[PDB]
């Protein structure tokens, strides 16, 4: 029954996160962060919205979405680099 819709209000929040993740993977052995990886943030936001049975992707839903997606890329890094990206993405 639930199919939440989207409004492009948080576009700057997601786009800059996507750019930030790509920049930190340019020279580090890590996940193949691509367009398909950005789509996970939006789709996983839909799941959080679809948990509330709401019809709208709110700002909060993306907030849970971005934290889950960005943390995954940070955790799967070598020890010497993990502690640096810990603080580089503290905004998110």
């Amino acid at each position: 029954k639930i199919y939440p819709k989207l409004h492009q209000m948080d576009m700057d929040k997601v786009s800059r996160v996507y750019a930030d993740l790509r920049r930190e993977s340019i020279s580090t052995g890590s996940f193949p962060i691509t367009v398909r990886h950005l789509e996970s943030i939006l789709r996983i936001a839909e799941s959080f919205a679809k948990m509330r049975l709401s019809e709208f992707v709110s700002s909060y839903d993306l907030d849970r979405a971005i934290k889950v997606v960005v943390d995954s890329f940070v955790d799967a890094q070598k020890v010497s680099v993990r502690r640096q990206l810990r603080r580089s993405f503290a905004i998110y």
Binding site: G29, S30, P32, E39, I44, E46, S47, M51, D71, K78
Partner: protein, 193 residues
């Protein structure tokens, strides 16, 4: 439903209820929670399509319940098909070939992915299977369909199902001093889906 729906902060209620008899692993249970609900399979303007279900890969050391969660998604999702790495074949997953006992014609029979349409597919020990058995999964994770060309049968089936996979790192222990792309026998393509 709407009584629970109006409860403040429902998201943490669902996540806390994902297999409650497993301690910790909250950043993993949220992936299970998000994959069970799925997304929106947006057939954008008809001419474009994007999958909606969330694919999850569980990786880590033995003794971390990477498999028993997949023994929970089976009992919770509406339609779930469970498989094991070395116990599954390429033909047995995608589709099989049969001859009609009445009309003597070539007929096709659906596999694990075809069964799990509008459901979930659960693969255990994803790394230990042979390369060819792992290769057929590529189409399902992005197209949600099975493409076959065998014995004069040229068609495509519907395989809309999320895939939850458990695996082990090379050597059986995870080397935290090395990248993930180096810790597993898989490759960027397979990890990309």
């Amino acid at each position: 439903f709407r009584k629970i729906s109006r409860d403040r902060g429902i998201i943490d209620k669902i996540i806390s209820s994902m297999a409650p008899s497993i301690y910790g692993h909250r950043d993993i249970k949220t992936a299970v929670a998000c994959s069970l609900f799925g997304g929106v399979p947006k057939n954008v303007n008809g001419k474009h399509s994007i999958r909606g279900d969330i694919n999850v890969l569980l990786l880590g050391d033995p003794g971390t319940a990477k498999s028993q969660i997949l023994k929970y998604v089976e009992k919770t999702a509406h339609r779930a098909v469970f498989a094991t790495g070395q116990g599954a074949s390429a033909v047995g997953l995608t589709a099989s070939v049969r001859k009609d006992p009445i009309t003597k014609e070539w007929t096709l029979e659906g596999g694990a992915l075809v069964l799990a349409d509008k459901g979930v597919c659960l693969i255990d020990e994803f790394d230990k299977m042979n390369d060819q058995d792992r290769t057929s999964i590529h189409e399902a994770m992005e197209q949600q369909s099975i493409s076959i060309s065998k014995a004069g049968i040229v068609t495509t089936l519907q395989a809309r199902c999320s895939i939850i996979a458990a695996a082990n790192p090379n050597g059986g222990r995870y080397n935290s001093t090395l990248p993930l792309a180096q810790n597993v026998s898989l490759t960027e393509p397979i990890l990309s889906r």
